[PDB]
Design a protein around this ligand. Structure first.
Ligand SMILES: *[C@@H]1O[C@H](CO)[C@@H](O)[C@H](O)[C@H]1NC(C)=O
Ligand SMILES: *[C@@H]1O[C@@H](C)[C@@H](O)[C@@H](O)[C@@H]1O
Ligand SMILES: [Ca+2]
Length: 306
């Protein structure tokens, strides 16, 4: 989104003549050929269109057209003046600025009280190249009887960048992005954000790429069944005692532990030493054993004496 602006700087028509050779409304004085009966009522028409190597006099004003109201007589100098809504033409555009253009600028005499219509004083035309910039470029139409000067520029609208004023960037800090804008309209992510729109939170250094995730920067939220600072430890089956997991909800037994919960001792003899009075213990199953009793002892643990 941009604007092509045109400002009138000066007009000099010392005798008050039209392009056709006649005076701006009135009779020419025989001899001195001075136009003394009236002065021009000078206004300007502007036509902006696509580049033409061979500039046509007519045709459509594709990029826009405009006119100023009457802004002075035969001669006026606005060079030391500021320039207001009356002596300037604004031509907005929403298409990417093509750099190349054709510009028609004409000085006209107003006649809205007499028999004759509005008549052209002088015409300027050219084709050129212009990039977005706040800097004005002066152009002078000083080849005919009436001379005029004007300045032009192309400016980008707010948050627009590049040669076509077409690249949009407005800084943001919400669920659509967390960034600032470059001098080129590029997005520069706030600390803790990544991706083209700076909308992907950077997770805790070491966060599991398989089981860890983000919503806010610096965190590590675990996938269901995963735990730990880096979400890289599985959660064993609830109820698991002497077992481990490689995957969530597993209960893989440690040595000499049995059962789905790894709570059944396969070395009851080693852990409890239940055979009393010099008896020998034998592991025979989960939480199971058998005692072989010396002479004079009886019972499951050789506890019955005599
Ligand atoms: C930065 O801006 C330039 C000019 O528009 C563009 O070519 C380039 O791809 C941009 N870089 C990034 C990271 O978008
Ligand atoms: C196991 O069996 C019992 C009866 C005793 O003889 C022990 O010394 C042996 O280790
Ligand atoms: Ca007039």
């Amino acid at each position: 989104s941009g604007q092509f602006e045109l400002e009138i700087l000066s007009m000099q028509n010392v005798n008050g003549e039209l392009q056709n050779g006649n005076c701006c409304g009135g009779a020419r004085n025989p001899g001195d050929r001075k136009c003394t009966r009236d002065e021009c009522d000078t206004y300007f028409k502007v036509c902006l269109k696509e580049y033409q190597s061979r500039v046509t006099a007519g045709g459509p004003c594709s990029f826009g057209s405009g006119s100023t109201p009457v802004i002075g007589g035969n001669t006026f100098n606005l060079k030391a003046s500021r320039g207001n809504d009356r002596n300037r033409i604004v031509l907005p555009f929403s298409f990417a600025w093509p750099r190349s253009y054709t510009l028609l600028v004409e000085a006209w005499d107003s006649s809205n009280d007499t028999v004759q219509p509005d008549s052209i004083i002088e015409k300027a035309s050219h084709s050129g190249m212009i990039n977005p910039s706040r800097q004005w470029q002066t152009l002078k139409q000083n080849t005919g009887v009436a001379h005029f000067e004007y300045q032009i520029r192309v400016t980008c609208d707010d948050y627009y960048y590049g040669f076509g004023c077409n690249k949009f960037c407005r800084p943001r800090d919400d669920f659509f992005g967390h960034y600032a804008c470059d001098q080129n309209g590029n997005k520069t992510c706030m600390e803790g954000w990544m991706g083209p729109e700076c909308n992907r939170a950077i997770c805790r250094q070491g966060c599991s790429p398989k089981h860890g995730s983000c919503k806010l920067p610096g965190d590590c939220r675990c996938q269901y069944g995963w735990q730990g600072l880096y979400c890289d430890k599985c959660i064993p089956h609830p109820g698991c005692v002497h077992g481990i997991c490689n995957e969530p909800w597993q209960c893989l037994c440690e040595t000499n532990w049995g059962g789905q919960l790894c709570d059944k001792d396969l070395n009851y003899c080693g852990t409890h030493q239940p055979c009393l009075n010099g008896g020998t213990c034998s592991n025979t199953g989960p939480d199971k054993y058998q005692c072989s009793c010396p002479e004079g002892y009886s019972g499951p643990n050789c506890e019955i004496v005599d």
